[PDB]
Every structure is written in C-alpha cells, then in structure tokens.
C-alpha cells in the first residue's frame, strides 16, 4: 500500500509523455518494490523524460523542411535550456543544436542557432557549459563550407573571450580559433582570424602578466605599459616576464633557505632548487640557481649544509654536458673554498673539484681546476692543508 507522495509519484510517472511504456512500467515496478525511494525514481523518470524529449525534438528539427518549423523547434530547445536550470541536460541541448546547425542547408538557420548558443554562453555562470558551447561552435565553424558562417562564428567566439575575466576560457577560445585558422583553405579568412587572435593573445598576455606572483609592482607595470605601447610583441614581453618571474622565485627560495633555522627545511629547499635546475632546460635560470645555491653555502653557518649544497652542485656538474655551466659551478665551488673558514670544508671542496678534474675529458676544465686549487693553496697558511692540496695537484698533473 502506497502513501500520498508515493501515490502522487505514481500518477506523475503515469503522465510523463516522452517515456515509452516499458520505461514507465519499469519505474512503476521499482516504485512498488520500494516506495521509500519515491522521490528518487520520480526525479530519475522526469530526467529521462526530458532527455528523450529533446532527442525527439532534435530529430523533428532535422526532418523538418519548413524553415519556420525548425525555428520553432530550435526555439523550443533554446527556451528549454535557457528557461530551465539543469546542468548536464543543457550540454546535450547545445550538442543537438550544433548538429542541427552542422546539417543545416539554410545559412539563416545556422546563424539563428549560433546566435542562440552565443546567448546561452553570455548568460551563463557555469564555466564548463561555456567551454562546451565554445567547443561546439568551433566544430560548427571548422566543418562549415560557407565563409560567412566561419567569420560570424569566430567573431562570436572573439566576443565571448573579450567579455571574460577567466584566462582559461580566453586560452581555450584562442586554441579553437588557432585550429580553425590552421584547417582553413581561404587566405583572407585566415588573415582575419589571425587579427582576432592577435587582439585576444594581447588580452590574455595582459592578464597573465598581471597574475605573475614573483615580480614587483614596478616591473609588472613596466611590462604591461610596454604591452600597451607595442601590443604586437605580446609574446616577447610575456616570455620576458615569465622568465623574470621564475628568476625571482628562485632567489626567494634561496632567501627562505638562508633564513631557515631547521636543517631539514634547508635540505628540502635545496632539493627543490637543485631538482628544479636538473629538470629545467633554461640555461640562464640554471645559472642563477647555481649561484644562489653557492651564496646559500657561502653564508651558511652549518658544516652539514655547506657539505650538502656542495654535493648538490657537484652532482649537477657531473651529469650536465654544458661547458659554461660546468665551469660556472667549478668557479662557484672554488670561491666557496677560498672564503670558507673551516678546514674540513676546504678539504671537501678540494676533493670535489679533484673528482671533477679526474672525471673530465676537457683540458680547459682540468687546468682551470688546477689553477683554482693553486690559488686556494697560495692563500692557505696551514701546512697540512697545503700538503693535501699539493698532493691533489701533483696527481692531477700526472693525469694528463
């Protein structure tokens, strides 16, 4: 025996128009199996009923020869996505509208549907439904054969991007217009899309440069003002900013390492710098990381941390095949050793540079290391240390 809301669920299920009989009887059977789920089944049924509804509508828009019938069907679907509030269904409706457009023989009808989708995106707070509309409009353009349809749709996407604060949507629109231009045989269509892409890319670069966290207010203002004075170089400026942004990030890590009082934290920061340099393929950034590590070692007061950093730089020199970088690490280690006041550290660095020299095939590196150690020995007033360095030097000379 049912109860009011379960019986009402029964009657409603009995009246859903876009279910076939077997789906209705399934939902009724399930309601009789467990009336406590009455709400659930009801909502489930209603969702199914509307989804098949739009499907029915879709095929009626696609079989209709009267250009007004398709306007009424598309308008009905449009009012069903707009005037309703359901997240996943509206996506299905933009996909069906898009198919109706893709198969449309009349350009006016395509323009109407595209306008409707543009208005769904413009009046939407759901980022992923705007992304889906962008995807579908973009596909309509790529498959369109009339030039005017393509121009209209890419101008629509451009206006969607120029009324947006979100950078991911601007970059996604930029990638869809890039694909449309790349698969376009018509040259003036390509040139127009590229002008649009220039404006959009300058906008996006403006937002990115504003969002970069590790530059001060004054170089960010410098970059955006140079962006205003010559927009065409939005790439050249943005690259600059990003490089500078990571550069001053590295220095900040270095400073955060210098000011840490916990050995384990300094170790973690040094691993983050080092293993950022090892996996990064930017030459001057790696250079800056090396000299920042060297400075951390230079002013560090803990023997363990100097040894750790020296070991890190050595490990970077042994696996790197960049000559200027390896000589840069060698000189950095060398002046760490010259300025260090602890014999254990001088001896360790001398052994490290010696290992590098014995590893090296290059005579410029071997003899530069040799002269570095000769300087170190020239400034040492401790006879055990000068003997140590003299042995290392004589073995290095016997090497080659």
Numbering used by the authors: 4 to 403
Give me lines lifted from the publication on this model.
Here, we propose a method for generating proteins and protein complexes with complicated shapes using fusions of alpha helices. To design amino acid sequences that can stabilize the alpha helical structure of the fusion sites, we superimposed one or two turns of terminal alpha helices of connecting proteins using a molecular graphics program. Then, the amino acid residues important for forming a fused helical structure were chosen from the two natural sequences in the superimposed region. Our method does not require complicated computer calculations for the design process and can be used for the assembly of artificial protein complexes with predictable and rigid structures.
We designed another repeat protein using a protein A-DHR14 fusion protein as the repeating unit. The repeating unit was generated by fusing protein A and DHR14 by superimposing 8 amino acids using the shared helix method. Then, the repeat modules were connected by superimposing 6 amino acids to form the repeat protein. The crystal structure again showed that the two helices had been fused into merged and extended helices with a geometry closely matching that of an ideal helix. We also succeeded in producing novel repeat proteins that have a protein A-designed helical repeat 14 (DHR14) fusion protein as the repeating unit. The overall shapes of the two repeat proteins that we produced resemble the horseshoe-like shapes of natural repeat proteins. Each repeat protein family has a characteristic value for its curvature, which exhibits little variation. We have shown above that we could generate repeat proteins with a great variety of curvatures via the shared helix method by employing different repeat modules.
